[PDB]
Each structure stands twice: as C-alpha cells, then as structure tokens.
Amino acid sequence: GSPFNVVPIHNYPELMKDTCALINAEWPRSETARMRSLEASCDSLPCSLVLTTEGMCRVIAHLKLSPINSKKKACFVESVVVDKRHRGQGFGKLIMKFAEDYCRVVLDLKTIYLSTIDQDGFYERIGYEYCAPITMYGPRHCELPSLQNAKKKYMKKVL
C-alpha cells in the first residue's frame, strides 16, 4: 500500500523543525521565523499541510493555506515547496490536489489563489488560470517595498 500521508502541521509538532528546514532550503530565513508561521496553523485558516510518510521520519512537501481578508470563500496558498531530491516525482501535484480537495470539502471554499515568480508553468499544468493580482490584507496596509512584488504572477483555480 501507499505510505504517503498529508497531515496538518499542528497535529505533528515532531515535524516542525524538518518543515522549517525544508522551506528555509528554498527561501533562507531564521528557524524562528518559519516556526512562527507553522505555529499559527489551525483547523480553519491559516493551515500548513505537510506530506510525510509511514514512520514520519521526514517531510517531503509543504504548503500553507492562508485567509484572504476580502474573500470569505477563498484562500491563498503560499510557501509551496517539495524537498529537492523528491522533485519531479509527482509530490507537488499530490499535495496541491490534496489541498484543493481539503479547501473544497472540509473548509467549504470556492476558489484558491496563489502567486508565483517563475513556476507558473507548473500551476498551469495542474489547472490554474492566470488572473489579476489580489491582496490578502485589508486596505489599512503598508509593507516594506520590494521589486519582487511586481514580478509575481497571480493565478487562481475555481474548485
């Protein structure tokens, strides 16, 4: 049988330091900064899902489902990363499909949004459509400017 299992991180604190290492391998930040994001995971939004296996000795993939201030029936998927040595083996599509079903069936959401700088070909392949930019915050917002923001390509999938 299949040993693969997608689980919410708040039920598997044993996997938190491995998940921090996984995300920080792609986008280097402090361990504590990643822990703060994972510690916010709960049974509504936000929620971090990790792909693990029988024996939970490792973490293969991670993604975060985040609320959108202006869209009660939608969510923003962020920090999608598969372990490097496990890439190109279907695990990205696996955890994305699991998250899509989770949002539709468990959270009763209608749409998933995301942004990407250079992996829009992966999301287009698994059924995402390019769309106009959206914000997950309210209008009383100001964050430190970065040129990376205008590079992002926003995409959505009607569930």
Partner: peptide
C-alpha cells in the same frame, strides 16, 4: 511564493 514565500508566505513571509
């Protein structure tokens, strides 16, 4: 993209 990176959530933080």
């Amino acid at each position: 993209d990176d959530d933080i």
